[PDB]
Amino acid sequence: GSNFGGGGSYNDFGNYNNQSSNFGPMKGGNFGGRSSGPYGGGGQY
Amino acid sequence: GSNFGGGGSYNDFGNYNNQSSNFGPMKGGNFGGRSSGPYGGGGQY
Amino acid sequence: GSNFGGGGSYNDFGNYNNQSSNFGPMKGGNFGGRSSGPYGGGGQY
Amino acid sequence: GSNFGGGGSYNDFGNYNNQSSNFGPMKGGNFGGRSSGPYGGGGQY
Amino acid sequence: GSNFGGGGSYNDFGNYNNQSSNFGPMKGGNFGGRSSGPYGGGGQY
Amino acid sequence: GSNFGGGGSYNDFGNYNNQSSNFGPMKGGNFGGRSSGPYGGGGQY
Amino acid sequence: GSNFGGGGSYNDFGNYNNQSSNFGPMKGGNFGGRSSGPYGGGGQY
Amino acid sequence: GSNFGGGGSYNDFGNYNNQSSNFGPMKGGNFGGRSSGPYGGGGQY
Amino acid sequence: GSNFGGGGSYNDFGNYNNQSSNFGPMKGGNFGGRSSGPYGGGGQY
Amino acid sequence: GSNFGGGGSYNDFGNYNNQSSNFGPMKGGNFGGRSSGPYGGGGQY
Amino acid sequence: GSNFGGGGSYNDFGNYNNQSSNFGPMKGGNFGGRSSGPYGGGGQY
Amino acid sequence: GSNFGGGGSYNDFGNYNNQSSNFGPMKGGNFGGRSSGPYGGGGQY
Numbered sequence: 010g011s012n013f014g015g016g017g018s019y020n021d022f023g024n025y026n027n028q029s030s031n032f033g034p035m036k037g038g039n040f041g042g043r044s045s046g047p048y049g050g051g052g053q054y
Numbered sequence: 055g056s057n058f059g060g061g062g063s064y065n066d067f068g069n070y071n072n073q074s075s076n077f078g079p080m081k082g083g084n085f086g087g088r089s090s091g092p093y094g095g096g097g098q099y
Numbered sequence: 100g101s102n103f104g105g106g107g108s109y110n111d112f113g114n115y116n117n118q119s120s121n122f123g124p125m126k127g128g129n130f131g132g133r134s135s136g137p138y139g140g141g142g143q144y
Numbered sequence: 145g146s147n148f149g150g151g152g153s154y155n156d157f158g159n160y161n162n163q164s165s166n167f168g169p170m171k172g173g174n175f176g177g178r179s180s181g182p183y184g185g186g187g188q189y
Numbered sequence: 190g191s192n193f194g195g196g197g198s199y200n201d202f203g204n205y206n207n208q209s210s211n212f213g214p215m216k217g218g219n220f221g222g223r224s225s226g227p228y229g230g231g232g233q234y
Numbered sequence: 235g236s237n238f239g240g241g242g243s244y245n246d247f248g249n250y251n252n253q254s255s256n257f258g259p260m261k262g263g264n265f266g267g268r269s270s271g272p273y274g275g276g277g278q279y
Numbered sequence: 280g281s282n283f284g285g286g287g288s289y290n291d292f293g294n295y296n297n298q299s300s301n302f303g304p305m306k307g308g309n310f311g312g313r314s315s316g317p318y319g320g321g322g323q324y
Numbered sequence: 325g326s327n328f329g330g331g332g333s334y335n336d337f338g339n340y341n342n343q344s345s346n347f348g349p350m351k352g353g354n355f356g357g358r359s360s361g362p363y364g365g366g367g368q369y
Numbered sequence: 370g371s372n373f374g375g376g377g378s379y380n381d382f383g384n385y386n387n388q389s390s391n392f393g394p395m396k397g398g399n400f401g402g403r404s405s406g407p408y409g410g411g412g413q414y
Numbered sequence: 415g416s417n418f419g420g421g422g423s424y425n426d427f428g429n430y431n432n433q434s435s436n437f438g439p440m441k442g443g444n445f446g447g448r449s450s451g452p453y454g455g456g457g458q459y
Numbered sequence: 460g461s462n463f464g465g466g467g468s469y470n471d472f473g474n475y476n477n478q479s480s481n482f483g484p485m486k487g488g489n490f491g492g493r494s495s496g497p498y499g500g501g502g503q504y
Numbered sequence: 505g506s507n508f509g510g511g512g513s514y515n516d517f518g519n520y521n522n523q524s525s526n527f528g529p530m531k532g533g534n535f536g537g538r539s540s541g542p543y544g545g546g547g548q549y
Contacts, residue, residue, distance in 0.1 A: 461505060462506075462507045462509075463508045464509045464513075467511070468509050468514075469514045471514075471517075472515070472516070474518065474519045475519070476521045476523075477523070478524070479523070481526045481527075482527045484528040485529075486531045488535060489522070490536075490545070491534065491536045492536040492538060493518075495540045496539075496544060497542045498543045500535065500545045501533070501539075501545030502545070502547045503549065504543075504548070
């Protein structure tokens, strides 16, 4: 009889995938991975 | 008799996929991965 | 009878993936990995 | 009967992956790894 | 009956990976590893 | 019945990896390892 | 004027997705990922 | 004028995803990842 | 005018993902990662 | 005019990911990482 | 005009990741890392 | 005009990661690191 997240627990556990593959010349970018707060994620500015 | 997220638990567990593949020259970007807050995700500005 | 995150515990445990592979010349960038706070993530500025 | 993060514990334990591989000449960068606070992550400025 | 992070404990224990491999000439950089505070991470300025 | 980080303990214990390997001539840099405070991490300036 | 896979090149570059999510008790398995050769893929025998 | 896989090159570059998430007790397995040769992939025998 | 895998080169460069996350008790296994040769991958026998 | 894997070169450079995270008691195993030869990968026998 | 793996060179350079994180009691094992030859990888026998 | 692995050179240079983190009591083991030859890797027998 074990509690597993019961109560008001905010239980966020999701798998996330960003995948990209290119044979030719890649000047651009695939910006992946979690981010939070204003302007999260990478790039120019 | 085990509780599994019972109660008011906000139980968010979803698989998310962003996948992209290109043979030619890739100047642009596939912006993947979770984000939150204003202007989340990468790119110019 | 063991509690596992029960109560108000904010239990965030998600797998995140950013993956990228390119045969040609790569001038651009795949910006991956967790970030938080203003302007999180790498790049010009 | 062992407590495992029960209470208000903010229990953040997620696997994060940034992976990148390129055969040609790589002038750009894959910016990975956790960051927090203003302008976290590496790059020009 | 052992407490394991119970209470208000901020229990942050996540695996983080930044990996990169290139056959050709690498002039650029993969900036990995934890950082905090303003402008964390390496690069020009 | 042993306390393990219980209370308000800020228990931060995460594995972090920065790995990079290149066959050709490497003029650039992989900047890894923990940093904190303004402008943490190495590079020009 | 750049060749991009021209000639007899067998150019196989397809995105493939296997995704599955279940709230209840999962005794079975979602067998995903590429396989080749006799009896490829996992399971009993 | 750069060749990009031209000729008889067998150019296989595809993104593959296996993702799975379950709230309840998981006795079974999601067998992912590339395999080749007889009986590739994990499981009993 | 640079050759990029041209000729008979077997150029295999694909991103592969195996990801899995479970809140309840996990007795089973997610068997990921490349394998080759007879009976590749882990498990009982 | 630089050769990049041209000729008969077997150029295998793929990113591979095995990731898994579980809140409850984990008796089983996620068997990841490359393997080759008979019965590659870990587990009982 | 520099050769980069040209000829019959078997050029294997791939990033591989095995990552796993668990809040509860872990009796089992995540068996990661390259292996070759009969019965490569760790575990009972 | 510098040769970089050209000829029949078996050029194996891959990053490999095995990472694992657990808050509760860990009786089991994460067996990482390269191995070769019969029964490579650690564990009982």
